[PDB]
Paper text:
Unique membrane topologies, such as those from G-protein-coupled receptors, are not found in the soluble proteome, and we demonstrate that their structural features can be recapitulated in solution. Biophysical analyses demonstrate the high thermal stability of the designs, and experimental structures show remarkable design accuracy. The soluble analogues were functionalized with native structural motifs, as a proof of concept for bringing membrane protein functions to the soluble proteome, potentially enabling new approaches in drug discovery.
Claudin folds are composed of an α/β mixed secondary structure in which there are four transmembrane α-helices and an extracellular β-sheet. We tested 13 designs for the claudin-like fold (CLF), of which ten were found to be expressed in soluble form. Five designs were further biochemically characterized; three were monomers in solution according to size-exclusion chromatography with multi-angle light scattering (SEC–MALS) and were folded, with two showing a melting temperature (Tm) above 90 °C. The CLF designs showed sequence identity below 13% relative to the native fold and nearest e-values to natural sequences below 0.063. The CLF design series showed that our approach could be used successfully to design soluble analogues of membrane proteins with simple membrane-spanning topologies such as four-helix bundles. To assess the design accuracy, we attempted to crystallize the soluble analogues of membrane topologies and obtained high-resolution X-ray structures for one claudin, one rhomboid protease and two GPCR designed folds. The CLF_4 structure exhibited exceptional design precision in both backbone and side chains, as indicated by an r.m.s.d.Cα of 0.73 Å and r.m.s.d.fa of 1.28 Å. In addition, the four helices were mostly hydrophilic, as evidenced by the low lipophilicity potential on the surface.
Numbering used by the authors: 1 to 101, 107 to 187
The structure:
């Protein structure tokens, strides 16, 4: 049955690599929003900064006051993504060290710890994603019928797929832990 455990562990490692990749891509991917009644201006959200890019090619970095409704939600999303990136990289390093390596029961405990932290991080990320998506959908509802907002959900979908892959890896690690501790 150790071969089954090996298959599950390597699948979890693969899913963790994929999760880290998708998380870095999501952090790199900016949130684009074609602002309305502005002469085809696009509001780009990148690294906690807001940029207006005009059709002619002008780009202005606009500082958003801490009081606007968008700043807190977007910053919470950014910070959750950043913290998830750090946590996932830490857990990846720990799982690699585990696979390389003392005490089988301690390794079972370590796998349980890894999976629990992975699950918590994935669920917090999904929670932040849901909050930000609800905010954006309400923002688009607060608009006239003719006026339409075209948002590029690339980063949000990347983050959601990454959180789901992390959850899958966590549940695979949990299967390993259960089938081994018993």
């Amino acid at each position: 049955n150790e071969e089954k455990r090996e298959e599950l562990l390597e699948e979890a490692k693969r899913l963790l690599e994929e999760s880290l990749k998708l998380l870095k891509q999501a952090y790199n991917t900016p949130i684009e929003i074609d602002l309305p009644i502005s002469g085809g201006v696009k509001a780009i959200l990148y690294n906690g900064k807001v940029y207006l890019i005009y059709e002619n090619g002008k780009v202005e970095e606009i500082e958003i006051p801490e009081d606007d409704i968008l700043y807190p939600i977007y910053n919470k999303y950014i910070e959750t993504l950043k913290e998830a990136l750090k946590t996932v990289e830490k857990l990846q390093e720990e799982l690699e060290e585990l696979l390389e390596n003392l005490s089988e029961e301690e390794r079972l405990e370590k796998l349980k710890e890894l999976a629990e932290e992975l699950k918590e991080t994935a669920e917090k990320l999904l929670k932040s994603i849901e909050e930000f998506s609800k905010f954006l959908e309400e923002l688009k509802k607060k608009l006239p019928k003719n006026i339409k907002l075209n948002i590029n959900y690339s980063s949000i979908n990347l983050a959601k797929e990454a959180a789901e892959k992390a959850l899958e890896a966590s549940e695979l690690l949990e299967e390993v832990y259960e089938s081994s501790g018993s």
